[PDB]
Design a protein around this ligand. Sequence first.
Ligand SMILES: NC(=[NH2+])NCCC[C@H](N)C(=O)O
Ligand SMILES: O=S([O-])[O-]
Ligand SMILES: O=S([O-])[O-]
Ligand SMILES: O=S([O-])[O-]
Ligand SMILES: O=S([O-])[O-]
Ligand SMILES: O=S([O-])[O-]
Ligand SMILES: O=S([O-])[O-]
Ligand SMILES: [Zn+2]
Ligand SMILES: [Zn+2]
Ligand SMILES: [Zn+2]
Ligand SMILES: [Zn+2]
Ligand SMILES: [Zn+2]
Ligand SMILES: [Zn+2]
Length: 270
Amino acid sequence: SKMRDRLFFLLSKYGIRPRDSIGQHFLIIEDVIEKAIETANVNENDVILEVGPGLGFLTDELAKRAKKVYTIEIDQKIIEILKKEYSWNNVKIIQGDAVRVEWPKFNKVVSNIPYKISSPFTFKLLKTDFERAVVMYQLEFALRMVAKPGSRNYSRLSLMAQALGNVEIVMKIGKGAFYPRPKVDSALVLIEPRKDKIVLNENLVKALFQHRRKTVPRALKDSIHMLGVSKDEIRGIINNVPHSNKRVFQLYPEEVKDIEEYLKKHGIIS
Ligand SMILES: NC(=[NH2+])NCCC[C@H](N)C(=O)O
Ligand SMILES: O=S([O-])[O-]
Ligand SMILES: O=S([O-])[O-]
Ligand SMILES: O=S([O-])[O-]
Ligand SMILES: O=S([O-])[O-]
Ligand SMILES: O=S([O-])[O-]
Ligand SMILES: O=S([O-])[O-]
Ligand SMILES: [Zn+2]
Ligand SMILES: [Zn+2]
Ligand SMILES: [Zn+2]
Ligand SMILES: [Zn+2]
Ligand SMILES: [Zn+2]
Ligand SMILES: [Zn+2]
């Protein structure tokens, strides 16, 4: 393992630990890096966003092919290492939490995504304008992203992915491709924005999917009551909601949109 050795050499050169966070797993196989890049069709005109460059193995490959790369890294020591170890003309390193910082404009994402931020990063991405995202997640998370309405793992993530994106698992990635080796496989995921998006009210979606096992009427009565309004105000309106015979985890985007329009009509959503 050429690149695994390079990892050990760099780690010890700067005397740094393999992880700043329990879920840090460096991508250390060149063919997986190149597969991600080729899946994304990275070319000389692309502006790329990466999150968590680590010791910069994917960043390096991106920089050779892309017009510009923005890479977001929380750890200042990692950043110092990237700056000393590489010579790129076309990489802007953004210090901070990728979930919290403002993103530059980009047309593509090519990134390994730490599991700890997989969910908030993906919700943020789905709300941005991009042409294509090729990202690596833990396999179970990727399977959540492509779950179908009514499956056990269909969640708010699944709904928004279906509503806003076209998502494909391109392949599994073995745990052998990272150091340290994770306990589970990863997956390479391709995301493109839907041309005809189903744009859903985020507060409604969160309210419904708080307790996704609940019936649609119960989920709404409970969530709206907890906002601070009397049950008496909303009981009859909620009892006549469309798709009331479903549990929330069975709802298609199209059905959530119906609920939203009904709720706006009845003064429950502003
Ligand atoms: N495994 C893959 N490369 N799948 C490619 C999907 C391409 C995508 N649906 C598009 O509209 O461009
Ligand atoms: O701790 S690693 O398996 O995300
Ligand atoms: O090509 S990278 O090593 O600056
Ligand atoms: O493909 S998993 O079994 O490493
Ligand atoms: O996309 S919103 O539901 O976080
Ligand atoms: O909260 S009021 O509408 O009874
Ligand atoms: O069933 S809803 O799309 O009218
Ligand atoms: Zn980091
Ligand atoms: Zn190469
Ligand atoms: Zn689980
Ligand atoms: Zn619950
Ligand atoms: Zn009460
Ligand atoms: Zn329905």
